[PDB]
């Protein structure tokens, strides 16, 4: 017995310098009509108002890492990081996380400086999210739309979309932080419209037969090569740069050191690097994430 | 009677989030050998240490707009912007500006999120700078190396390189702020080496015969389309994005509004837009600069 998704949010500016989501959220707040469908209206939300006003990723800490139950359930304090305070507001608005009052679905919009193209980022393999990705793939022949599965591996989910009963991140790159490209703005705007169309079809009872699809599952990160003092000793190798989701094979170059030497991948198997050279990840010690490409069977969603 | 250039500086991190210059300056500070030539050694300088440590363009104000004689000659104050304080240090180091103690040449390194490719930015048409550009063009067949002339039009020059008797900015894009690409790092490193080779040949007495070359001269800026509240109402049109230094003709699209309409260029003549969609220029109200392409005659530099 299918439950429609009637409480749906689209969040932008979770990171204040990722410009598509910032400007889409700002635009929809003045022009909500675009987010309405017959069965439901999506609420646009500017997730990090202060980082957005300042055009930076975050003020005190990364909002998209502050939505764990531990943070949300913490006793308030004047000294709390801004984004912890804001996370608690989002929990009031779209949660409380893990309870029956939480929103049905939150679509959280992101941009990356990595050449990811269009990808959906999910913290679990819930079949609805896979059907959604498949639907976007179908609506956009020739346009890659990949699903990146990032299981928290324990213990606590941490993202803004995790506050809702379900949700997903739409990530689009490459785009410099603080830069709004018309091409990505329009594409994201059209993909959001399609995601809302999908929710509408789902609500109206569309049968979604079982299928198989390739997805990418997080294996873990690789840091930039560093000096003893943890400064960069090199950066992403020219042959790896811009090649997100493409096979990286053992013995292939992953970094170029300032001293001139190549650093080769020393893994035992082929992996698929994602988020290659994201500005925001330098301080996180991630030059790229390794993923495994796996073919999964997606259960039917039938009335 | 030619005067050699013996006091030469290469400045990086004038803007703390432009990563090629940041990491080249950091690397050369530990490995200066690369900046030595028979007749002279270039001194590497990290221009904005605090913005660089924080990986942002500036802390209080843009350092590359703080080197006017007015700022440099201002009475110090605890309340002074950080970059005004730092500008005064650079004036002590490489100046004082407009006096005989100033450095012979400062090469200031920049990155832009605009697709400029390689360009040299000069605040005057001094023939040495044009010969330099021509030499780089010759050393790199097939690689555009364009000269952008940005006369202050009065009254005061404002850049870090303007502190020295002469100088120039080497600008390379596109690169996201906070991202270091190996390809641009190596290219800038090789161009710096060539600039130093040129200074060495000049010092050793190379004759530089007169020639003609095309350059681009600043006409002024065009702001993003804005709402009454000065927020973005659109961004750079997809047909203009990434097309720096290419002809923009009257009647051609320059912006795409969020409402869907195109904004067309309404100028009387063809211009050549530069710095199209630079992150740092949003707050400066510049979506691009208009330039005129002009063929100039460059005087010989003979012993
Ligand atoms: Cl489906
Ligand atoms: Cl990439
Ligand atoms: Cl020449
Ligand atoms: Cl551009
Ligand atoms: Cs509608
Ligand atoms: Cs790719
Ligand atoms: Cs040398
Ligand atoms: Cs170009
Ligand atoms: Zn993000
Ligand atoms: Zn700069």
UniProtKB/Swiss-Prot annotation, chains A, B:
The outcome of changing residue 281 to A is: Drastically reduced activity
Q: What is this protein called?
A: N-acyl-aromatic-L-amino acid amidohydrolase (carboxylate-forming)
Similarity comment text for this entry: Belongs to the AspA/AstE family. Aspartoacylase subfamily.
What Gene3D superfamilies does its record include?
2.20.25.160, Zn peptidases (3.40.630.10)
**Which HAMAP family has this protein been placed in?**
Aspartoacylase
* Cofactor note text: Binds 1 zinc ion per subunit.
Query: Which Gene Ontology molecular function entries are recorded, alphabetically?
Result: aminoacylase activity; hydrolase activity, acting on ester bonds; identical protein binding; metal ion binding
Q: Which residues bind Zn(2+)?
A: 15, 18, 110
Taxon lineage: Eukaryota, Metazoa, Chordata, Craniata, Vertebrata
Task: Give a brief account of the tissues where this protein occurs.
Answer: Expressed predominantly in kidney and to a lesser extent in liver. Weakly expressed in heart, small intestine, brain, lung, testis, and stomach.
Q: What is its main location?
A: membrane
Q: Where is this region: Hydrolytic domain?
A: 1-204
A GO cellular component entry from the record: apical plasma membrane
Q: What would be the name of the gene that encodes this protein?
A: Acy3
Q: How does activity depend on pH?
A: Optimum pH is 7.5 with S-benzyl-N-acetyl-L-cysteine as substrate, 7.6 with N-acetyl-L-histidine as substrate, 7.6 with N-acetyl-L-tyrosine as substrate, and 7.7 with N-acetyl-L-phenylalanine as substrate.
Report the source organism: Mus musculus
